[model samples]
Target: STGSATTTPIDSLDDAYITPVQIGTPAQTLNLDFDTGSSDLWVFSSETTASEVDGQTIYTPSKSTTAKLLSGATWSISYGDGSSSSGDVYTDTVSVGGLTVTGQAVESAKKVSSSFTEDSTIDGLLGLAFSTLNTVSPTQQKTFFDNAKASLDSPVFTADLGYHAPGTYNFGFIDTTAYTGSITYTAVSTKQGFWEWTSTGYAVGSGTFKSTSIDGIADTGTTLLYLPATVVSAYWAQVSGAKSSSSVGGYVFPCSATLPSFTFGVGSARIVIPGDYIDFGPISTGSSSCFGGIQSSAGIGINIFGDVALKAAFVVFNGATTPTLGFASK
Candidate 1:
C-alpha cells in the first residue's frame, strides 16, 4: 500500500543519498540515487560499453523475463554538473521497498560520462520529479513514482535527509516520528517540472530579514545551495576572510573561519541553516580552503535549494493540482 526506503549518505562525498531498489523480475537489486531534480529512471546496464563500465553494477535486462523493449525509443540526460547518460528504453517491473510498479520505463545506459563511471556506488538514479520531465524520446516516459501513484494510500513523499547519518524517504505516508515541530506548508509551482517555490525572504545570522524574494527549486541531486549573485555576496560580506574564488569556484573562506547561520522564509516559517553546514567540505582534499555551501546561481538561471539546504529540514513533496512543500525543523 505504501513504500519507504532507508537513504544513506555516500561516505566522504556527502553530496547525495542512495537506497536499494529492485528492478525487473526476480528482483535484481541496485543502489539508486533518489533525485527530485529530474524525471528519468536511468541506470548503468549491460548495454554500456565494456570500457565505460567501471565498478558499477550493471542492470541486465536480458536476464529479466519481465523486461520488454520499447522499440525505436531512446533517452538521454545531461545534468547541470556536466554528468550525462543516454540509452534505450525498456518497460519492466520495478519495486522500491514494498511497493511495486508494473511496466515502468527503465532506461538502460549505453554510454555514461566519466563522472558516473567513476562513481561506482550509485548504480542509477530514480527520479521523483513530475512525469513531464521524463527524457525518453518518441514518447516521454513515466517515472517509478508516477506509475505507482494511483495505488498509493496518499500521493506524497517525505524526504528526511540527514547530515552524516542515515535518513529515510517515505512514500504515500508520513512518519511523525521522523520530525519535530509542526510542518509549515507553502504552495509549489511545477511549471518547470520542478518543485519550484518563492521564498518570502532570507536573513544571514541574526541580521534583519530583507524582503528579497528568491525563486528556486528543491533539488535533491544538487550538492550545494545556490542563490542569486547579489544575495550570495551579501552573506559572504558578513563572514571574515570569505572571498569569491575563481580558482576554486564559488565563495571560499579560511578553514578556521566561523560561519553565521542562514535563514530562508517559506510562508511564515523561518528555516535556519546552521552555521557549520555552510562550510561545504574543503575545496579539495586536505586543503585548508573550503568552498561556501551557498553559491551564486548566476549562470544556472534558477536558484537551487540543494542537499545542503534540504538536509536541514523535513520536506514533504505533496502531489496535488497545486503541489505543496511542507517544511518542519529536523
Candidate 2:
C-alpha cells in the first residue's frame, strides 16, 4: 500500500502544513496538521467542551458505525509552548490522502487549550513520529506509518516540502524526479522517539564551512529553524541593523537588510537555504523590522531543523528495523 498527500501551508508564515484526512466509518473529512515531531493522532470531537468547539470540525465517534471505544484508554499531550489537549481513545478506520488504515486508534479531545479552540485553520493533528512517543495509557498505540509500514510496498515515506507552493508527502516509495543528485543517508537516533540526526557542520553565506557536529531533529511540526547559539548569532552578526527584541519575539532586522544564505552538511552532501527565506517577514503590518527565520535553540537543549530547513531539501524517512534519514537537494 502507498499513500500520497498534498500539504498546504497554513499561513503567510508557513506555520504548519495542513493535509486532509478521513476518519471513522462515514469518513468525515477534516483538515489536519501533519506533525512529525510527536506521535498521537488527536482531534477535536463532539465530546470536547462546547466552548472549545469554535470553528473546528469535530469528530463524533458515536455517528461512525466502525468506531469502538477503547474502554479505559486515555491520552494527553502538552507542547513546549504550553498548549495542551486531553481525551479518551477509540479505534476506527482512518485514512490519509489515499492510504487507508483500519482499526487505527483515534484519540478524541474532551478538553483543549485556547490556542486549539480559537484556531480555525486546522481541526486536529496527525502525528508521523515514532510510536514510542505516543501518549496513550494502558496500551500505547502505533502511528499510522508504523501500522502500515509492513503492508506498504516499501517501508519509507518522503517529505518534499516547497517554499510557498503545495508540497507532497508520499508513503511506501520515493519519487526520484522530485530531487537532484545523490541522497545522503544518515543514521537516525530514535532514543527520544524523534527523527534526530547530526549535521556535520554549517556555513553562513559564502563563508568557510565550519566542521562541527550539530545534533538536531528533523521536525516537520515546528515552523522555524533553530540552531546553536553561536551559529544563530553569527548569521545575524553579518546582517545590518539586526537586533534581538522581546517585543518582536525574536531576532529582528531592518526589512531592507540583505541576509546571507545558510548551508548545512548532510553526510557527504549539503543543502543551501536562500537568504530570501531567512528574512521570514515583517514583524508587524507595514513595519520596517522583520523577524529572522533562524533562531537559537540554546536552551531547548537540541537544534530543531524544522519547516524552514525541511522546505529546502527532500527528506526521506526509512522505517526499516534500522531506521535512517536521507536528505537531497531538490
Candidate 3:
C-alpha cells in the first residue's frame, strides 16, 4: 500500500541529526525528535527540579486544557549522551495531519535543562519505532507503536523527518514497486533489528566496490553511514587533497573541486551514496569530504547504513507483514 510523501527538517541535537515530532493540540504544540532507536518520550516541564539544563525541547502542559495523565504509571529515560529525566505518564487525545488518535500515551518531564527548555519549535518525541530497544520499558511491554497500534489505519510507520530543512513524512504501507531493482531481503537476528548483509567492497568517485568484502548493518536510526576505521582511512586516501578535521572527533575531506563517486553492494544490489550528502549540513571539511563508512573495528562489528542513505531511497520494513524488508524509490 503506497502513501504520499511529506517533508520536515532534521533537528540537530548535540550535532547528531534528530527526527522531529510534535505533541499536544494545535492551540499548544511542543516539538521534538521522534526517535526510532529508543522509546522514551520525555519533555522538559516547568516543574522540573534541575536548576541547569542545556539545549532540549521543553513543554508546559498547564497551558493545555485537553491534557490528562495516565494513573500510576510514571516514566524515565537515560540517554547514551548521559542525559536523564523522570515524569508521570498520561493518556491524551492527539492528532497528526488527517490522523486522529485518542488516549495516546505521553510522558511529561518534571526535570530538564535550558537547552531542552529553549527548544520552542517542538515539545517532545513520539517514539513509535519499536519496543525492543525501548528505554521506557524494563520488561519492554509498552511502546508508542504498541499503544497506538489499535488506532492506526495499518501498521504504524514513520519517515525520517529531516533536519534543518523539510524532509519526507512517510507513513502507513510501503510500496515495493518504487524500487528500480529487486528487494534484497535479510533475516532478523535474535537482537530484533532488521537483518543486513556484509558489504564485499566500496569505491568512491567511480561506482565500484573494493576488493575487500566487509559486513555492514542497515539502521534508520543512525544519521550517518558508519564504516570501519581502516575502511574509512583507505577510502579517504583516494580523494585528491583530502584532509581530516576534528569536528565530531574526525571528519574526512578533499579540496572543494575534487570528489569521487562511491558505491557498495548488497548481494548484487549495488547502493551508491553521493559524496556531497556524505558530508551534509553546515559543517564540512572539504566540500567533497568523504567520511569513513566504517568506524574503528569495534561496536556492532560491521557497517551501518544510516539516514545518509535512507533519504535517497524508500525502504519498507514489513515486520508485521513478513520477515522481509522491501526497498522502493522516493
Candidate 4:
C-alpha cells in the first residue's frame, strides 16, 4: 500500500537522479530515472537494438513467467531534450521499493536515441506524471502511481530531492521528519499533462521581491531551473563575470564567482535555492569556468522548476482528481 525509494544523483554535476526498480516475476532490478515530466514506464530490454544499448542493464521479458504481451500495443516517447525511445508493450509484475503492482504496463524498448544509450548509468525511466501523458497506443496505460493510488494509505506521493546527498520518493505518506516548517499547499494544473503550478513572486539573494505570476512545471527529470529570460537575467546580473558563453553553449561564469541564492514564492511561503547549488559545476574538465544551473525558459516556451529548484524543498504531489502540490523547506 505504500513505498519508499532512494534517488541518487548519478553524475558529479547532478545531471540525473536514478532509483532502483524491480520488474518481472523473478525480479530483474534496473536503475531508472524517476521522471515526473513524462508518463511511460519504458526500459532498455531484450528487444532493443543491440548497438543501441551500452553498459545499461536490459529487462528480458522472456525471463519473467508473469510477463504477458499487450496485443497490438505500442509506445513511443520523445523528451524535451530531443532524445526518444519506443517499443511494444508488456504487462508484468513491477515493484518500486516495497510496493508491488501485479499488472503494470512495461514498455519494452526496441529503439532508443543516442543520448539515452550514452547514459549507461540509467537503464530506463519510470514516469510519475499523470496517466494522461501515457504514450501507449490503442489504449493508454496507467502509470505505476496512478494504478497504486486506490490502494495507498493516501492518494499522494512526495519527492524529496537533494543537492549532492541522496534523495527519496515516498508514496502513500509523507515523511514528517524530512522537512521543516508547515507545508504550503497550492493548486496544480494537470490539463497539459504536467505537475504545473504558479509562483507568486521571486527574489534574488537579499534583493527586493518582484511580485509577478510565473507559470511553471515541477520536473524531476529535467536538470536545470528555467524561468523567464528577464528573471534569469536579473539573477545573473548580481554575479560578476557572468555571461552567455558560446564555449559552454549556455550561461557561464568564473568558477570562483560568488553566486547569489534564488527565492521563489508560493502564497506567503518562500523557498530559497542556495547559492552553492547555482554553481552547477565546471564548464569543462578542470576548467575555471562554471556553468549556471539557472537559465532562460524563452526558447522552451515554458518555465520549468527542475531539479535545481526541487532539490531545495520537500515536494508533495497529491493525486486527487483535482490535484494539489505541497511545498516545504527542508
Candidate 5:
C-alpha cells in the first residue's frame, strides 16, 4: 500500500481513468473513462429497454457467464454537460493482467445520454471525476477509490493512456514507462476539481505553458485539454499553419507540420504533452484539421488538463489517505 501518509483534496476525474469492479466475482471488469469531473459508471445491460441516453453505450452484460447484479444499491448520475443515467450497483469476479479480485462494485445504468451514449463500442464509463454529484443519498459517498483504499496492494492506482491507441488504466500498480523520472508532483488541496496550475508562461513548438503547473487530480472521462486562454493561445501559436476558424470551435493546425513540445511539473514530476493529442479533435468541436488543444472556456474559473493532455503520461491517484495524484515513468 502507498500508505495513509498522503494528502490532497481535489475530486475531479478526467480522461483515461478507470475503476475496476466485480460482476459475479472479484475484478470482473475495470471501468475507464474521461472522468475526474463526475462519479458514475453505466454499463450495457443484457436487458436494455431501448431508451435514448445521449453519449451512452448499452452493453449485454448478461452475455457474460460470470455476470450478476445485487438486489439493491441503485445508482444514477447527471453530468454538467447534460447527460444522465440510472442503474444498480453490482459485484462480480474480475481480472486485470494476471491479478484477480472479486466483489467489486459495478453500476448498471441502462438509460444514459450526453457525450458517452453515442459511443457504441464502449460498453460504459467509469467516471472518477470529482463533482460531489451522484445518486447516493446523504451525499457523503466516497468514490470507488475513496472506499477501496483499504484493499489495495499499494493503496495506489495509475493510468497509462496511449496516443490514439487503446490506453490502459491500471489499478494497484503504476506503469513506470509513462514518465522520465524528472517529473515533479505537488499535493493538491482538498476539493480542487480538475487539475489547475498557475501560468508560468508558454511557448509553442518549444514553447510551454506559462508554468501554471500544479499537482492536481487527473481524469480520463474528459476530452480535450482544458486550459486558460493564455496558455491555449501560446501553444496554438506554434502549430504549423495554425488557424482558428468559427467553423471549428478549437485551434486547428495544418497536418504537414509537427507541433511543438509542451511540459509541466507535478510534485517533482514533469509531464510532457504530445502533439498527436492536440491533433485529434472531437466532432463536437467541428474542427477536424486543427490540433484541438484549446476551446472557448476563457473564464471558466478552473483549468482542466483533459484526456488529450493526460494521454501522454502515466498518472497515479493516491487514495491511500486523501485524494492526491502522482506521476511516474511506466
Candidate 6:
C-alpha cells in the first residue's frame, strides 16, 4: 500500500505549503512545512522558550506515552534564508497521511530564530532532503520517508506544487491522473544532499535560448526562483521599468509593466514560467512597485528552482539507487 499527503498553501504566505502530521502515541497533530532544501525534522515544542514561540502550536513529548528522549542527543540547523533552530531529540511514532513509522527521531526545538518564531502559522518543518543532511549530533537521523520506505510498495515520492492552490505530496506510488503527457526524466546528482540537476539552457521572455548548462536544486521550501546574476539581469532587461533596486533588495519593476515568460530547457523539454508568476507581489502598498520572483543567485552560490519554478510543473523525486527527477505539465 502507498501513502499520500495533502499540502495546502498558507493563504497569507503563498511561498510554502503545509502538511498535517501526527507524532508520538495518541497522535498529536501538527501543521508542518514540507521543505526539500534541508534535512532536519525539527518542531516547536514545550522545550522551546515561551518567549520564542509566538502563536505556533507546541508539541509536548511528556504527553505522549511512547515518547523517549535520546540521551545526550542534540540537533541544530541553519537555512539559507537565515532561519535557524536547535534542540534535543525524542524518539516516537511519527505518521504522515495513513503511513506510520516506529521510533522516528523527532527533534524538539529549544531555540528558534525570529524568522520562525514570527511565523505563527508554521508549527514545524519536515525535511524532505537526503538523510545524510540530518543535523542530529552523536548520530544522524533519517527522514520520515527514509524510515518508512522499506515497507512501502515503491521507493518514490511526487511533488505537485500549485500556484496559490492546494497541492499534494504522494508517497510510494504515482497517480497517473495528476499529470498530463509523459514525464520527462533527468538524472539527479545527490552528492550535495539535494535534488540537484542540470538545465540544458534557458531563455528570457521568448528570447533566443542560451546553450549553457546550469546546475540547480529543486527546492519547495524556497519562495522564489534564483538564477545567476547574468540570467537575472537578462530577464529584467526585457521589462521596460525593471531594475535591480538596492532599497527593494532585489529586482523590481512597475506593477503595470508587461513581463515576459521565462523558459528553462530540461533536455528537450521546456518548462515556462508565466509572466504573472514572475511578478512576485507588491513591494509597497500605495506604490506601483513590485518585486520580481526571479532573483540573482549571487549569495546562495547555487541556483534554486524554488516554488515559483516548481509550480509550473509536476515534479517527481524518485528515490531509486540511480535517483532521477521526472517533470511533466500539470
Leading candidate by TM-score: 4
Q: Candidate 5 on 1-330: residue-level lDDT in tens?
A: 332111111122223333333334222343335355666545766444465543333344565555665665777777544666676665555434433444545567656664455654355655554435545433323455544556667766665666645555555665565466644444655455443333233345555334554332354555666666666676777665776676755666765657666665554445667665565534444534644654444545566666666666767665555556666544
- How close to the true structure is residue 46 of candidate 1, measured as C-alpha lDDT? 93
- The estimated TM-scores of all candidates read 0.97, 0.97, 0.73, 0.98, 0.73, 0.97
lDDT of 2 by residue, 1-330 (tens): 899999999777787788889999789888888788889999989999999888989899999999999999999999755789999999999988789999899999999999988788888888889999999998999998998899899999989887877899999999899999988999999999999999999998999898899999998888889998889998899898898787766799999998999999998688999887787788879999998999989778879999989999999999999999999999
Best by lDDT: 4
Lowest summed lDDT window (length 10), candidate 5:
3-12
Predicted candidate 5, C-alpha RMSD: 6.4
Q: Report the lDDT tens digits of candidate 3 across residue range 222-267.
A: 5666777776676667766655566645555543534444566545
Model 6 lDDT tens row, 173-241:
888999888888898999999999998888988688988998999998999999999989999999998
RMSD of each: 1.2, 1.2, 4.7, 0.9, 6.4, 1.2
Q: Give per-residue lDDT, candidate 6, residue 3.
A: 74
Q: Which lDDT values do the candidates have, in the order given?
A: 0.89, 0.90, 0.53, 0.94, 0.53, 0.89
Segments in model 5 whose C-alpha atoms lie over 4 Å from true places:
1-22, 25-34, 51-74, 88-104, 129-133, 138-142, 175-178, 192-202, 213-217, 267-269, 281-288
Task: For residues 97-167, write the lDDT of model 4, one tens digit per residue.
Answer: 89998899999999999999999999999999999999999999999999899999999999999898799
Give one digit per residue, the lDDT tens place, for model 1 in 1-330: 799989999875467888999998778999999999999999989999888888888889999999999999999999999899999999999988888999999999999999998888899999998999999998998888888877999988889888878888888998888778889888798899998998888999999998867999999988889999988998999988899988777799988899999999888788899888788768888988888989999999999999888998999998865789988897
Error of 5 at 263 (Å): 2.3
lDDT over C-alpha atoms for residue 297 of model 3: 36
Q: What clash count goes with each model? A: 0, 0, 40, 0, 100, 0
